[PDB]
Design an enzyme around this catalytic site. Structure first.
Site, PDB file in Angstrom:
ATOM      1  N   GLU A  88      70.108  24.231  22.218  1.00 39.97           N
ATOM      2  CA  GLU A  88      71.505  24.537  22.349  1.00 39.97           C
ATOM      3  C   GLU A  88      71.656  26.056  22.426  1.00 39.97           C
ATOM      4  O   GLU A  88      70.898  26.791  21.773  1.00 39.97           O
ATOM      5  CB  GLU A  88      72.266  23.974  21.139  1.00 39.97           C
ATOM      6  CG  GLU A  88      73.775  24.153  21.210  1.00 39.97           C
ATOM      7  CD  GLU A  88      74.229  25.431  20.545  1.00 39.97           C
ATOM      8  OE1 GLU A  88      73.372  26.108  19.914  1.00 39.97           O
ATOM      9  OE2 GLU A  88      75.436  25.750  20.655  1.00 39.97           O
ATOM     10  N   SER A  89      72.644  26.502  23.205  1.00 43.47           N
ATOM     11  CA  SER A  89      72.919  27.924  23.417  1.00 43.47           C
ATOM     12  C   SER A  89      71.678  28.686  23.933  1.00 43.47           C
ATOM     13  O   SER A  89      71.115  28.306  24.960  1.00 43.47           O
ATOM     14  CB  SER A  89      73.494  28.551  22.150  1.00 43.47           C
ATOM     15  OG  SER A  89      74.300  29.669  22.482  1.00 43.47           O
TER      16      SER A  89
ATOM     17  N   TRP B  50      86.041  26.023  10.302  1.00 43.14           N
ATOM     18  CA  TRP B  50      86.812  26.926  11.172  1.00 43.14           C
ATOM     19  C   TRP B  50      88.242  26.383  11.364  1.00 43.14           C
ATOM     20  O   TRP B  50      88.460  25.178  11.261  1.00 43.14           O
ATOM     21  CB  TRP B  50      86.119  27.053  12.538  1.00 43.14           C
ATOM     22  CG  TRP B  50      84.796  27.707  12.469  1.00 43.14           C
ATOM     23  CD1 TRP B  50      83.574  27.091  12.411  1.00 43.14           C
ATOM     24  CD2 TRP B  50      84.539  29.117  12.400  1.00 43.14           C
ATOM     25  NE1 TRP B  50      82.575  28.032  12.333  1.00 43.14           N
ATOM     26  CE2 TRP B  50      83.135  29.281  12.326  1.00 43.14           C
ATOM     27  CE3 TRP B  50      85.356  30.252  12.398  1.00 43.14           C
ATOM     28  CZ2 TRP B  50      82.532  30.541  12.258  1.00 43.14           C
ATOM     29  CZ3 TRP B  50      84.767  31.492  12.356  1.00 43.14           C
ATOM     30  CH2 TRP B  50      83.359  31.634  12.269  1.00 43.14           C
TER      31      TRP B  50
ATOM     32  N   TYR C  90      84.779  30.489  19.272  1.00 41.17           N
ATOM     33  CA  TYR C  90      83.942  31.047  18.203  1.00 41.17           C
ATOM     34  C   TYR C  90      83.642  32.525  18.444  1.00 41.17           C
ATOM     35  O   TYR C  90      83.600  33.312  17.510  1.00 41.17           O
ATOM     36  CB  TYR C  90      82.662  30.203  18.105  1.00 41.17           C
ATOM     37  CG  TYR C  90      81.474  30.784  17.371  1.00 41.17           C
ATOM     38  CD1 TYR C  90      81.436  30.830  15.992  1.00 41.17           C
ATOM     39  CD2 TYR C  90      80.364  31.237  18.071  1.00 41.17           C
ATOM     40  CE1 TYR C  90      80.321  31.339  15.317  1.00 41.17           C
ATOM     41  CE2 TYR C  90      79.260  31.740  17.422  1.00 41.17           C
ATOM     42  CZ  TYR C  90      79.239  31.795  16.043  1.00 41.17           C
ATOM     43  OH  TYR C  90      78.124  32.298  15.405  1.00 41.17           O
TER      44      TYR C  90
ATOM     45  N   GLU D 155      84.226  26.052  24.209  1.00 44.29           N
ATOM     46  CA  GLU D 155      83.040  26.903  24.187  1.00 44.29           C
ATOM     47  C   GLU D 155      83.369  28.332  23.764  1.00 44.29           C
ATOM     48  O   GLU D 155      82.576  28.973  23.073  1.00 44.29           O
ATOM     49  CB  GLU D 155      82.373  26.907  25.558  1.00 44.29           C
ATOM     50  CG  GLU D 155      81.663  25.602  25.906  1.00 44.29           C
ATOM     51  CD  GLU D 155      80.377  25.393  25.077  1.00 44.29           C
ATOM     52  OE1 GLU D 155      80.026  26.292  24.276  1.00 44.29           O
ATOM     53  OE2 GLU D 155      79.720  24.330  25.226  1.00 44.29           O
TER      54      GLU D 155
ATOM     55  N   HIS E 117      81.646  26.182  19.820  1.00 49.68           N
ATOM     56  CA  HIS E 117      80.236  26.287  20.178  1.00 49.68           C
ATOM     57  C   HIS E 117      79.355  25.944  18.961  1.00 49.68           C
ATOM     58  O   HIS E 117      79.564  26.496  17.901  1.00 49.68           O
ATOM     59  CB  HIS E 117      79.996  27.747  20.586  1.00 49.68           C
ATOM     60  CG  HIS E 117      78.695  27.990  21.271  1.00 49.68           C
ATOM     61  ND1 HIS E 117      78.433  27.554  22.556  1.00 49.68           N
ATOM     62  CD2 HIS E 117      77.603  28.688  20.877  1.00 49.68           C
ATOM     63  CE1 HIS E 117      77.231  27.967  22.920  1.00 49.68           C
ATOM     64  NE2 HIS E 117      76.708  28.656  21.919  1.00 49.68           N
TER      65      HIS E 117
ATOM     66  N   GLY F 201      71.661  33.268  20.273  1.00 43.25           N
ATOM     67  CA  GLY F 201      71.743  34.442  21.137  1.00 43.25           C
ATOM     68  C   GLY F 201      70.460  35.258  21.310  1.00 43.25           C
ATOM     69  O   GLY F 201      70.521  36.450  21.628  1.00 43.25           O
TER      70      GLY F 201
HETATM   71  C1  LIG Z   1      77.324  43.785  14.605  1.00 38.83           C
HETATM   72  C2  LIG Z   1      77.882  43.271  16.012  1.00 38.83           C
HETATM   73  C3  LIG Z   1      78.351  44.212  17.025  1.00 38.83           C
HETATM   74  C4  LIG Z   1      78.854  43.717  18.304  1.00 38.83           C
HETATM   75  C5  LIG Z   1      78.899  42.274  18.569  1.00 38.83           C
HETATM   76  C6  LIG Z   1      78.443  41.326  17.541  1.00 38.83           C
HETATM   77  C7  LIG Z   1      78.474  39.881  17.767  1.00 38.83           C
HETATM   78  C8  LIG Z   1      77.981  38.996  16.692  1.00 38.83           C
HETATM   79  C9  LIG Z   1      77.483  39.506  15.419  1.00 38.83           C
HETATM   80  C10 LIG Z   1      77.455  40.945  15.209  1.00 38.83           C
HETATM   81  C11 LIG Z   1      77.925  41.839  16.271  1.00 38.83           C
HETATM   82  C12 LIG Z   1      77.997  37.470  16.881  1.00 38.83           C
HETATM   83  C13 LIG Z   1      78.465  36.921  18.071  1.00 38.83           C
HETATM   84  C14 LIG Z   1      78.966  37.828  19.225  1.00 38.83           C
HETATM   85  O1  LIG Z   1      79.399  37.300  20.299  1.00 38.83           O
HETATM   86  C15 LIG Z   1      78.961  39.277  19.048  1.00 38.83           C
HETATM   87  O2  LIG Z   1      79.385  39.971  20.018  1.00 38.83           O
HETATM   88  C16 LIG Z   1      78.359  35.317  18.030  1.00 38.83           C
HETATM   89  C17 LIG Z   1      77.089  34.812  18.906  1.00 38.83           C
HETATM   90  C18 LIG Z   1      78.177  35.126  16.456  1.00 38.83           C
HETATM   91  O3  LIG Z   1      77.566  36.394  15.930  1.00 38.83           O
END
Ligand SMILES: Cc1cccc2c3c(ccc12)C1=C(C(=O)C3=O)[C@@H](C)CO1
Ligand SMILES: *[C@@H]1O[C@H](CO[C@@H]2O[C@@H](C)[C@@H](O)[C@@H](O)[C@@H]2O)[C@@H](O[C@@H]2O[C@H](CO)[C@@H](O)[C@H](O)[C@H]2NC(C)=O)[C@H](O)[C@H]1NC(C)=O
Ligand SMILES: *[C@@H]1O[C@H](CO[C@@H]2O[C@@H](C)[C@@H](O)[C@@H](O)[C@@H]2O)[C@@H](O[C@@H]2O[C@H](CO)[C@@H](O)[C@H](O)[C@H]2NC(C)=O)[C@H](O)[C@H]1NC(C)=O
Ligand SMILES: Cc1cccc2c3c(ccc12)C1=C(C(=O)C3=O)[C@@H](C)CO1
Ligand SMILES: *[C@@H]1O[C@H](CO)[C@@H](O)[C@H](O)[C@H]1NC(C)=O
Lengths: 532, 537
Positions: free
Chosen positions: B199-200, B436, B334, B331, B444, B119
């Site tokens: 990826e991603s 999982w 997760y 997808e 994903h 991300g």
């Molecule tokens: C701390 C926090 C706040 C809001 C969204 C978060 C998110 C992750 C990790 C911490 C977050 C997070 C994902 C999210 O889609 C996500 O929205 C996945 C990419 C795995 O780690």
């Protein structure tokens, strides 16, 4: 002289005629005057009750067809001609018909009251397909049908005006229903057990009477075949009705102020108004009609959709349904590439142009949404799929989804509802195979027309017609179309389970969802889009 | 000294290590510096090339993970910890890794360059699942991977400013690709045959290099696994990036007694904060609670990207390009446990209709009520509107289609129609070792271990079928790298190219290839063709 054929009603004496059927005779009183002739100074005005007469009215033959457009798409073709006027046209047309068993019933018999369709611009109670003799003989009901004014004569409106208030064709129908309350017992009918039934604009009319308190007291149960008062073609707002009426006046050389405009319209021969009535529509379209019921706060105190949402329908039973292919018939009246005389294998461009013809007067954004939902994105250009898809567009938007919305709301608000889809294509159908089971083609089965030996239906079709007449009359007698358990039973439609039955040569089959995915689009989402 | 483990690159001399693999030995040069450490005054700035050194650098172990957020959703859980940093965090993290056959190739060998996802806020070339040794051993390619800056350090942007211009994490990747052009031949690699894969966010990065002319000259083919540069999470506009950077600065006290102001001064103040202090606040600058949205991502500012990826893709001529693209079977699943109401890896996540409706706003963030109603319309079964299992699956589809499947489908269709040869897959095998829950299907990120040949590692407990499957996939990927076509140069089932009309793709699973049509065509018509028109009006 035959006393069975002499009846006295409130206005005076009538003489009817004995009719034959393969099942035995029936009594008929055809062409009974129920209003003063709505002509000259009475054109566009609410109907006045027929004044009493001396002597005996000859009620042995159908009276004139209310002055209307005559279809010319396929001259001499059975599939269109069967809907065209089959008696002379006249503004003097407010007559009704009564069929009863022979000899006349001597105890109160359930009454079916038929309201013809025809887009509010056409139709007649004298059409061969509405012959009441078979239903009456087979099921022993009293059957009544009326003519009501159509086109400009029935629905031209300058809202607010005394000279042309609008909705006078619906008032003709209501006046006929009042006549039934006052006179049907003289024929053996029970005025406390009146079931209204109608197809297309006739079904929309039935719905409007349901939603208008002064009509609601005139009948007990309702049947809506392929039409609903909430259909997008079935009503017009005040502003647009005024616009159309005003344009019609212009097109016919009026004026030479509402009073003056109407006075000028009243000088014009009926045929002159008919010759221009299609031309006041805002665009070229299919399934849209110039002069239809107007929502002006009087007959309808709000849109049918709003009235339907607000209503408590405890104590109502209603039977509703559609044919298998609602949209197909309309496509030959203006969708590019369509004809009854070929396969109508249209192209993608024709499909896209056809979406604007069949979903008229919406934003480009709304049209794109329609195209999204009705395109198979794995086969976006396949002509047979495009043909079927545009049929679905027109049929879903104008008939299936409005009927589904009416059904779901009524059931949720207390009504007992039965739903069907009619899936038998008549052995005698003259339209091409691609059109499937088109709009209007269940009617001849409900009226038992296949029992007429001079016609060419199969023996299976006669049994099927007898089954349908029995469902309809069971419904009129009891609020429930079911015969005694044997079956399967026809379950009530509900907003959740959404069950309906297939009507075909085979025994009833229960299914779920009146095109639920498509109707969610038309009923739930598209209005939100149009509103923003 | 072993001559195989000594290489001279433009900056100086390196010493590497000989790695054992179940199939035989490979040479590895891990932790090669490719930029000056981007710390102190170099924080937020484009990378500077590494200055030459005298003597020998030991490239014998992975270097630090670029400073980043560490996931805490399920502490100690394998399915999350496998993505967490497995080396110390540091801003001093701009190193890359080269794996090459042992003995070194005698003629120029095709190069695969891996770009990790996460991300744009997380990831590292050191993760066990990206271990390049199996692929190099099995397929005899050269494999390169790089670390690049992430989160605020890589993507905080004050557009127009020289002190934090944005996209520096993409510039890190680009500098690594230049290094490959200049140096890979020293390892036996062919710089005229470089295939990027990721990826991603790493797949989105690959696509961004496709679309940025200065990167496009540094490689020849591309692989995009479960991501695309036109993904709705993958880029941000100038104003929103400025808003985010400004709010992050504000949350850590920059400037003191104020908001925004002189950019030079703002960034100077940000450069004084401890890395972990920026990290602690980075999630708080997003406009709402969402899933699959990340604060600091590539910015469309007319420089690295001259227009949105969507527009660049629509306008581009892609003759001469081969691309391989694909998705996993589930997808969306997760992401749901990170914020959709009612979801957990620890139960069945059989949500209510009310949770579904609320989840739509979390999963399709920042759109109008009308757009959200359109989503609900398209993803509700109106014969079963309240059925919990269907709702759970529908929200997974909403999130996966919106963020991954439909952006990949749009990229695939446009590139094919505009000249590229395209191959598409859906990956459908759930690993025997997956930790999982079953309801998440094939989530994903879970094709990567097969593509890297991880099941061939003895210490892991994959089945023999899975080892064979992994060998198949490595073979497709390396065939593609070698020839631009994953098919074997016979009686084997053939993988047809993807085209805008026929839309053919294959299913990757234990069974042989099955050809199918349409990457969720009905759903993607909604996301790609209609929803944008709705958003404009
Ligand atoms: C701390 C926090 C706040 C809001 C969204 C978060 C998110 C992750 C990790 C911490 C977050 C997070 C994902 C999210 O889609 C996500 O929205 C996945 C990419 C795995 O780690
Ligand atoms: C199917 O027929 C339509 C309608 O055409 C009429 O009926 C045909 C059987 C034949 O008699 C035609 O000559 C008639 O015009 C065709 O659509 C029309 O196409 C013509 C040009 O060929 C055009 O001038 C008309 O405006 C079109 N009418 C409409 C309503 O679109 C259509 O092409 C036929 N499909 C075929 C041949 O595959
Ligand atoms: C399924 O789990 C979610 C998430 O809850 C956590 O995981 C569970 C396995 C259990 O350990 C809970 O104690 C955890 O909170 C449940 O959603 C939560 O409900 C609680 C109160 O019941 C609420 O405080 C949380 O905010 C909710 N979390 C959300 C909405 O993400 C969900 O109810 C479980 N489903 C069941 C039990 O059927
Ligand atoms: C003359 C004319 C112009 C525009 C539309 C017409 C239409 C019909 C007949 C004549 C029309 C017509 C139908 C339409 O949908 C329709 O749009 C069906 C109800 C059958 O007759
Ligand atoms: C911002 O402040 C610094 C601090 O001295 C100064 O050097 C710089 O020129 C200023 N820039 C602008 C645009 O004001």
């Amino acid at each position: 002289e035959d006393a069975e054929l002499l009846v006295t009603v409130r206005g005076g004496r009538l003489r009817g005629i004995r009719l034959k059927t393969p099942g035995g005779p029936v009594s008929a009183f055809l062409g009974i005057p129920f209003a003063e002739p709505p002509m000259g100074p009475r054109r566009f005005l609410p109907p006045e009750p027929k004044q009493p007469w001396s002597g005996v009215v000859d009620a042995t033959t159908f009276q004139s067809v209310c002055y209307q457009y005559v279809d010319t798409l396929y001259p001499g073709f059975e599939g269109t001609e069967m809907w065209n006027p089959n008696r002379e046209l006249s503004e003097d047309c407010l007559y009704l018909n009564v069929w009863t068993p022979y000899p006349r019933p001597t105890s109160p018999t359930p009454v079916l009251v038929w309201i013809y369709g025809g887009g509010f611009y056409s139709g007649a109670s004298s059409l061969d397909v509405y012959d009441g003799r078979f239903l009456v003989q087979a099921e022993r009901t009293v059957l009544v049908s009326m003519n009501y004014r159509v086109g400009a004569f029935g629905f031209l409106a300058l809202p607010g005006s005394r000279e042309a208030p609008g909705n006078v064709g619906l008032l003709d129908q209501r006046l006929a229903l009042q006549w039934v309350q006052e006179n049907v017992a003289a024929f053996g009918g029970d005025p406390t057990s009146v079931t209204l039934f109608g197809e297309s604009a006739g079904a929309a009319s039935v719905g409007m009477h349901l939603l208008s308190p002064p009509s609601r007291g005139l009948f007990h149960r309702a049947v809506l075949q392929s039409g609903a008062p909430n259909g997008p073609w079935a009503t017009v707002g005040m502003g647009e009705a005024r616009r159309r009426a005003t344009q019609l006046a212009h097109l016919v050389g009026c004026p030479p102020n509402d009073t003056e405009l109407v006075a000028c319209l009243r000088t014009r021969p009926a045929q002159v108004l008919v010759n221009h009535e299609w031309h006041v529509l805002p665009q070229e379209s299919v399934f849209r009609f110039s002069f239809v019921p107007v929502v002006d706060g009087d007959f309808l105190s709000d849109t049918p959709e709003a009235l339907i949402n607000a209503g408590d329908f405890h104590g109502l039973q209603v039977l509703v349904g559609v044919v298998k292919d609602e949209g197909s018939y309309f496509l030959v009246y203006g969708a590019p590439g369509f004809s009854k005389d070929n396969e109508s294998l249209i192209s993608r461009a024709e499909f896209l142009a056809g979406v604007r013809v069949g979903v008229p007067q919406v934003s480009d954004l709304a049209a794109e949404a329609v195209v999204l939902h009705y395109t198979d994105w794995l086969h976006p250009e396949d002509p047979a799929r495009l043909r079927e898809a545009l049929s679905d567009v027109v049929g879903d938007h104008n008939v299936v989804c409005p009927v589904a919305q009416l059904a779901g709301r009524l059931a949720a608000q207390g009504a007992r509802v039965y739903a069907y889809v009619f899936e038998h294509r008549a052995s005698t159908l003259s339209w091409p195979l691609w059109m499937g089971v088109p709009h209007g083609y269940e009617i001849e089965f409900i009226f038992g027309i296949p029992l007429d030996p001079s016609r060419n239906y199969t023996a299976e079709e006669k049994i099927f017609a007898q089954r349908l007449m029995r469902y309809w009359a069971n419904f009129a007698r009891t609020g429930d179309p079911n015969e005694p358990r044997d079956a399967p039973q026809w379950p009530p439609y509900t907003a959740g389970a959404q069950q309906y039955v297939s009507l075909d040569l085979r025994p009833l089959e229960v299914r779920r969802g009146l095109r639920a995915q498509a109707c969610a689009f038309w009923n739930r989402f598209l209005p939100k889009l149009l509103s923003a």
